[PDB]
Enzyme design. Structure first.
Site, mmCIF file in Angstrom:
data_model
loop_
_atom_site.group_PDB
_atom_site.id
_atom_site.type_symbol
_atom_site.label_atom_id
_atom_site.label_comp_id
_atom_site.label_asym_id
_atom_site.label_seq_id
_atom_site.Cartn_x
_atom_site.Cartn_y
_atom_site.Cartn_z
ATOM 1 N N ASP A 227 23.886 -11.354 9.346
ATOM 2 C CA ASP A 227 22.428 -11.447 9.367
ATOM 3 C C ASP A 227 22.047 -12.449 10.453
ATOM 4 O O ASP A 227 22.892 -12.876 11.249
ATOM 5 C CB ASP A 227 21.864 -11.833 7.999
ATOM 6 C CG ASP A 227 20.504 -11.215 7.738
ATOM 7 O OD1 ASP A 227 19.544 -11.566 8.457
ATOM 8 O OD2 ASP A 227 20.401 -10.369 6.825
ATOM 9 N N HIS A 281 17.517 -8.529 11.732
ATOM 10 C CA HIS A 281 18.496 -9.311 10.973
ATOM 11 C C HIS A 281 19.726 -9.637 11.819
ATOM 12 O O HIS A 281 20.863 -9.574 11.351
ATOM 13 C CB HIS A 281 18.898 -8.592 9.683
ATOM 14 C CG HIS A 281 17.804 -8.528 8.662
ATOM 15 N ND1 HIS A 281 17.939 -9.052 7.395
ATOM 16 C CD2 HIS A 281 16.556 -8.008 8.723
ATOM 17 C CE1 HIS A 281 16.822 -8.853 6.718
ATOM 18 N NE2 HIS A 281 15.967 -8.222 7.501
ATOM 19 N N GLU A 346 13.347 -3.671 7.930
ATOM 20 C CA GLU A 346 12.116 -3.458 8.684
ATOM 21 C C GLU A 346 12.120 -4.228 9.998
ATOM 22 O O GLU A 346 12.365 -5.437 10.029
ATOM 23 C CB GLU A 346 10.909 -3.864 7.836
ATOM 24 C CG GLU A 346 9.568 -3.594 8.497
ATOM 25 C CD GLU A 346 9.332 -2.117 8.753
ATOM 26 O OE1 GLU A 346 9.818 -1.285 7.957
ATOM 27 O OE2 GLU A 346 8.663 -1.790 9.755
#
Ligand SMILES: COc1ccc2cc3[n+](cc2c1OCCC[n+]1cccc2ccccc21)CCc1cc2c(cc1-3)OCO2
Ligand SMILES: *[C@@H]1O[C@H](CO)[C@@H](O)[C@H](O)[C@H]1NC(C)=O
Ligand SMILES: *[C@@H]1O[C@H](CO)[C@@H](O)[C@H](O)[C@H]1NC(C)=O
EC number: 3.2.1.52
Length: 572
Positions: A227, A281, A346
């Site tokens: 991430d 991310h 998203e």
């Protein structure tokens, strides 16, 4: 010293009574009472088929349990390892510091694996089994587990171990005398998402998690391993990613460690499913590549959901050479997975629109800079990324993406298709996107944030107050969250569900409490899909919590232990 009470079943409740000496009735210990007072005894999850436990217990010599494998094959090493672990599974019935008297019957465990070469994970694998326990002669017990594969067989070993009880009044190890069980899971995907990038988790804590998963027949560890905050995955082909991305040199996941975790999971019927979240991310580890934009962009509220901001630049062709190498290194060590998770969280348009090279790229291809165009850029990325994933795994395989702007059912067919992509759902079970997706034939994994986000409820980690998805989700709520109710006639398209432990406020120290025993509620919901509610599972849930603690899991506490010993008096 000596236990003072006894228990007696009364209208489905074990009632605590004093063990008066002037009685000809033999005293019942608490869990011996529970085994027959409760409809499903101490089983978790309860079986789906035959669930006949009989009426009696037999005293068992702990040192006289022997497992015999009747059919040999390619899974010999797996079946032997599962067999050797069975005695310690049995010992979980005994409280720590207690020792059973080494008397009673001998136990013969017969394992019948009817396809002893099968050992691949797949959505179509056979996790069913049959369990029979009966007296054998005068001094012995015959327990026979019959299953179509090793995975069903080791599920049955799990259920069998739950048919032992320790009589702490007498210090006797007991076992249910007459058992007829047939069982199979309602859903093939029963998972936990572990985020090990927002905070690091020790390999030991990950294996401990897999142990507890196998104890309740969960079968998928979704390893959210990268991430924005860190890159602990050791990619041999792009080593600067983890060298720059790791929180520290020791907080990485080497090839050897991942192979350990993957093997540890296979032996316990747990598929270790890796995710590379993209194109959002991302962040740490990508420094000096010029392959990201908006890393640490300020003010972060204008560019991403949580700091640090950062997204991949899909217009740089070198990016997909990086991605192919990452995916290939993942495929090498994550070599039991049949599915690849590609994130799809998203994307921020404000992040992509603030880039010089990205806007020039969109001019040259007749694209505007409107909302629809950045969706077109996202589709451009996912198509090229998806091709590298296929090349990396050496085959086409199902890919998972989250529900997002990209996977809105109104336009998801523009470049995705329901045969290549599984959709993981974070929306509430009443969101219209679920119905729209199911009618378009898409398969779903439920991770409804109002019932399956296990990070919700704690304090804020930016500013004050509580975190974004509070309140804390009790086990009652995750138990009652039914995918069958959510999907209705399209039930078969629901592959199952997944508890999500996002880790901006969780790490090695909090892992046990975040997941257990709440993930056991999801385990029974996905294994059995009961028409009954949590109230009918409450007593068995209290017991499985105690079993987790006996395993060494620092499981959350649900109720006063007094309630566990005094069923029926704690209600509302
Ligand atoms: C992958 O799904 C995810 C994953 C991570 C998410 C993270 C955050 N947020 C939604 C998320 C989400 O979407 C969940 C849907 C949220 N959401 C949709 C519709 C109505 C709602 C009403 C109330 C609350 C939330 C409603 C919400 C803002 C937010 C603020 C934060 C923060 C995190 C989030 O850390 C620092 O400050
Ligand atoms: C054990 O029980 C199973 C199931 O009833 C039976 O098929 C098998 O023959 C039994 N074996 C022995 C040795 O009693
Ligand atoms: C992107 O930025 C340009 C100005 O550089 C602006 O005209 C356009 O509306 C922006 N688009 C979005 C979706 O923010």
């Amino acid at each position: 010293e000596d236990v003072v009470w006894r228990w007696s079943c009364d209208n489905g409740k074990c009632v605590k009574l004093k063990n008066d000496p002037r009685s000809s009735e033999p005293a019942l210990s608490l869990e011996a009472c529970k085994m027959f007072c409760n409809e499903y005894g101490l089983l978790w999850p309860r079986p789906t088929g035959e669930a006949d436990l009989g009426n009696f217990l037999s005293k068992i010599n702990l040192n006289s349990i022997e497992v015999k494998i009747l059919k040999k094959g390619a899974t010999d090493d797996l079946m032997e390892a599962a067999a050797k672990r069975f005695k310690e599974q049995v010992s979980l019935a005994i409280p720590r510091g207690s020792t059973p008297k080494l008397t009673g019957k001998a136990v013969d465990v017969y394992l019948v694996n009817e396809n002893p070469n099968e050992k691949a994970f797949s959505l179509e694998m056979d996790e069913s089994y049959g369990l029979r326990v009966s007296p054998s002669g005068a001094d012995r017990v015959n327990a026979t587990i019959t299953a179509n594969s090793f995975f069903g067989m080791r599920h049955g070993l799990e259920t069998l171990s739950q048919l032992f009880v320790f009589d702490d009044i007498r210090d006797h190890l007991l076992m249910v005398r007459d058992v007829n069980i047939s069982d199979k899971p309602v859903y093939p995907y029963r998972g936990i998402l572990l985020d090990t990038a927002r905070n690091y988790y020790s390999i030991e804590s990950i294996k401990r998690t897999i142990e507890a998963m196998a104890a309740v027949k969960l079968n998928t560890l979704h390893w959210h391993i990268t991430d924005s905050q860190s890159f602990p995955f050791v990619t041999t082909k792009r080593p600067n990613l983890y060298k720059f991305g790791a929180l520290s040199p020791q907080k990485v996941y080497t090839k050897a460690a991942i192979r350990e975790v993957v093997r540890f999971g296979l032996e316990r019927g747990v598929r270790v499913l890796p995710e590379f979240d993209a194109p959002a991310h991302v962040g740490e580890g990508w420094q000096d590549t010029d392959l990201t934009v908006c890393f640490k962009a300020e003010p972060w509220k204008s560019y991403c959901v949580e700091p640090p901001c950062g997204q991949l630049n899909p217009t740089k062709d070198e990016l997909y050479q990086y991605l192919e190498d990452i995916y290939s290194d993942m495929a090498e060590v994550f070599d039991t997975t049949d599915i690849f998770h590609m994130g799809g969280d998203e994307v921020s348009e404000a992040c992509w629109n603030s880039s010089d090279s990205i806007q020039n790229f969109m001019m040259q291809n007749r694209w505007d800079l409107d909302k629809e165009s950045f969706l077109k850029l996202w589709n451009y990325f996912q198509q090229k990324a998806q091709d590298k994933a296929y090349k990396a795994f050496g085959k086409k395989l199902p890919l998972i993406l989250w529900t997002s702007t990209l996977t809105n059912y109104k336009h998801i067919d523009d470049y995705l298709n329901k045969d290549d992509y599984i959709i993981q759902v974070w929306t509430t079970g009443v969101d219209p996107q679920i119905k729209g997706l199911l009618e378009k034939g898409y398969r779903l994994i439920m991770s409804n944030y109002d019932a399956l986000y296990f990070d919700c409820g704690y304090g804020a980690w930016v500013g004050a107050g509580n975190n974004w998805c509070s309140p804390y989700i009790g086990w009652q709520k995750v138990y009652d969250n039914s995918p069958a109710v959510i999907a209705l006639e399209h039930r078969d398209q629901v592959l199952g569900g997944e508890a999500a432990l996002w880790s901006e406020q969780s790490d090695t120290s909090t892992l046990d409490g975040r997941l257990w025993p709440r993930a056991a509620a999801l385990a029974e919901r996905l294994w059995a899909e009961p028409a009954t509610s949590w109230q009918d599972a409450e007593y068995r849930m209290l017991h499985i919590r105690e079993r987790f603690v006996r395993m060494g899991i620092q499981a959350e506490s649900l109720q006063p232990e007094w309630c566990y010993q005094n069923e029926g008096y704690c209600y509302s």
